[PDB]
Design a protein around this ligand. Structure first.
Ligand SMILES: CCCCCCCCCCCCO[C@@H]1O[C@H](CO)[C@@H](O[C@H]2O[C@H](CO)[C@@H](O)[C@H](O)[C@H]2O)[C@H](O)[C@H]1O
Ligand SMILES: CCCCCCCCCCCC
Ligand SMILES: CCCCCCCCCC
Ligand SMILES: CCCCCCCC
Ligand SMILES: CCCCCC
Lengths: 451, 127
């Protein structure tokens, strides 16, 4: 149905996302159990990690377009990422390595992320109708890999340890690289302009020097989140100043602030919603026992099923509004489940968390899939930078918010933790409901501005 | 996923016994281990437990007599039972639940040992 390089890109993307989410699903638990962080330290450190992983995505599109070429940067990104995964596996021998290893993943992701999507776009003549379907299959590829990782990585870490789990993440990247190298002939006339000139070693060294610097800067910021906070606060207020000095851009600003709220909520899945499942949900569904950390896999699951369906079925601002109402309902469902539908021992049915993740995933399908695509319809480079900066800030803010659900390591009673989760999830849901209503009210004015 | 309990037996009132719980493939380290007991004609009741990060929970009638502890090297959990009394007679089970929580009812725990008989006799030596 699709060009042959599509299937190569599909499977490179699947395996790279497998590696990434294999780490992400277990990282907060690893912080708590293996490094002895409190839940608060683990949550804010995960927020810092997630912030850097996202903010650095801005680097890989530029490097691929203008410095080394899309295909060269896929190779370099995959190599740095695999090195990062093996470095994380090694951090169990050398605990002092952990932050450097996470910086290597962040920077490696930064170089890699933007480029397979770019490559896929070049596999089709410019107005080919199959483009939309191919990109929906690409998103499904991301989420099949993520589904497998979130399902299996906690089981693997429980049965064989973290060193094995992280080495398998590295192996998944190695197998993405082997499949890419094996299919190189399929994309011989596909690439950005630098792919077809010989590689400039001047630019390659600039990219390696800058990468290593960034790896060390990431390690420092993740170790000292209290200065990551001020770095991003001052960067945010300053870039806000420089956005305000320089009206279709104002729509980009309000949509950016709405996305910030969205990412605050998305950031809870590996932290507060993860530990809520650990502490206050039954670990059995349809009669099978499961690792509650695997509950995170419900997000890609619902995406995998719902992206085709919703592909078959207003315009820009109303889809954002709809997504925000869905996310609000996810957290209100969590709060309601804990408030009214718990056992005498403080535990709630896992079907309530299935529903939380359904709502949350529909919110994702309305918002993050369809955000910067028609933020790109309203707009440049400055707003791309501000976009990534503010969404990284969103992940830091999300870690801070998750700390309101943090449980001391000495608490053992679900009736003590249930009211904490429910108070926080309910207040998140009420604030997000308010935000969705103001979005609804502004939908007509924005939709005029888009004209 | 399967726990083996050991160390039960017959003891006189005021004596002591130590139960131990070991798991097979999974690392017990990620688990809260609760000890339950079922006396003749009653339901399983929570006795004592330790979560994955050394938090402890106890039934009121065994406090000051029972101690739960964990040897994370041997991947084993222990119940030290001192000042034993006849009404402590029961089948004892260890149960394991992932994470930091020790719920009171058996339905909170997915993995179960098979049970060890503990009997405490009123026997005392002749004066
Ligand atoms: C809601 C998402 C569900 C994720 C789907 C899980 C993928 C299947 C796991 C791999 C094959 C099963 O392998 C094993 O099966 C048993 C029962 O099935 C499960 O349960 C066992 O392991 C996990 C973690 O090790 C423990 O939390 C659990 O209480 C234990 O009983 C695990 O999930 C899995 O270790
Ligand atoms: C495709 C050509 C391979 C180029 C690999 C060159 C690596 C340069 C090493 C620089 C060390 C810092
Ligand atoms: C591959 C580089 C390994 C660096 C680990 C540093 C650990 C220091 C422990 C003393
Ligand atoms: C297509 C080959 C890319 C070479 C990049 C490797 C740089 C270490
Ligand atoms: C953009 C919101 C920042 C809030 C800091 C407390």
């Amino acid at each position: 149905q699709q060009p042959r390089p599509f299937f190569m890109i599909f499977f490179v993307e699947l395996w790279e996302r497998f590696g990434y989410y294999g780490v992400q699903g277990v990282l907060a638990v690893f912080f708590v159990k293996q490094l002895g962080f409190s839940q608060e330290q683990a949550f804010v450190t995960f927020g810092a990690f997630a912030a850097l992983v996202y903010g650095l995505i801005s680097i890989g599109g530029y490097v691929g377009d203008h410095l080394l070429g899309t295909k060269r940067t896929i190779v370099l990104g995959a190599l740095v990422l695999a090195i990062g995964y093996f470095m994380t596996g090694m951090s169990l021998l050398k605990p002092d390595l952990i932050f450097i290893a996470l910086g290597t993943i962040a920077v490696g992701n930064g170089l890699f992320k933007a480029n397979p999507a770019s490559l896929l776009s070049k596999c089709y003549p410019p107005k080919d109708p199959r483009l939309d379907g191919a990109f929906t299959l690409f998103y499904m590829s991301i989420n099949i890999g993520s589904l497998i990782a979130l399902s299996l990585a906690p089981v693997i870490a429980d049965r064989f340890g973290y060193s094995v789990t992280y080495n398998l993440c590295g192996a998944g990247l190695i197998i993405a690289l082997l499949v890419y190298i094996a299919c190189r002939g399929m994309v011989k006339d596909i690439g950005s302009e630098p792919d077809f000139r010989p590689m400039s070693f001047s630019k390659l060294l600039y990219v390696l020097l800058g990468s290593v610097v960034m790896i060390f800067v990431c390690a420092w910021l993740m170790h000292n989140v209290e200065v990551a906070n001020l770095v991003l606060i001052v960067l945010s207020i300053v870039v806000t100043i420089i956005f305000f000095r320089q009206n279709k851009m104002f729509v980009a600003f309000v949509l950016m602030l709405e996305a910030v709220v969205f990412y605050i909520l998305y950031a809870q899945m590996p932290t507060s919603l993860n530990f809520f499942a650990i502490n206050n949900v039954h670990h059995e569904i349809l009669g099978f026992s499961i690792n509650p950390v695997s509950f995170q896999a419900l997000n890609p699951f619902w995406v995998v099923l719902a992206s085709p369906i919703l592909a078959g079925i207003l315009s820009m601002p109303m889809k954002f509004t709809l997504g925000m109402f869905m996310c609000s309902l996810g957290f209100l469902t969590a709060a309601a489940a804990g408030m009214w539908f718990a056992d005498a021992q403080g535990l709630t049915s896992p079907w309530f968390i299935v529903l939380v993740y359904l709502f949350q995933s529909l919110g994702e399908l309305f918002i993050s899939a369809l955000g910067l695509a028609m933020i790109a319809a309203l707009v440049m480079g400055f707003i791309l930078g501000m976009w990534f900066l503010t969404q990284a800030a969103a992940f830091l803010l999300g870690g801070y918010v998750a700390t309101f659900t943090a449980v001391p390591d000495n608490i053992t009673d679900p009736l003590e933790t249930l009211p904490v989760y429910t108070n926080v999830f309910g207040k998140i849901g009420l604030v997000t409901l308010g935000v969705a209503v103001v979005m609804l009210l502004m939908v007509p004015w924005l939709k005029r501005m888009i004209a | 996923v399967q726990l083996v309990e050991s160390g039960g037996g017959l003891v006189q009132a005021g004596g002591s016994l130590r139960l131990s719980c070991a798991a097979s493939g999974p690392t017990l380290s990620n688990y809260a281990v609760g000890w339950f007991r079922q006396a003749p004609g009653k339901e399983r009741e929570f006795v004592a437990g330790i979560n994955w990060s050394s938090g402890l929970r106890y039934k009121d009638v065994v406090k000051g007599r029972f101690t739960v502890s964990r040897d994370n090297v041997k991947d084993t959990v222990y119940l030290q039972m001192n000042s034993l009394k006849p009404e402590d007679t029961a089948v004892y089970y260890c149960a394991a639940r992932f994470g930091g929580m020790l719920p009171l009812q058996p339905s909170g725990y997915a993995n179960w040992g098979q049970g060890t008989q503990v009997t405490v006799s009123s026997h005392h030596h002749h004066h």
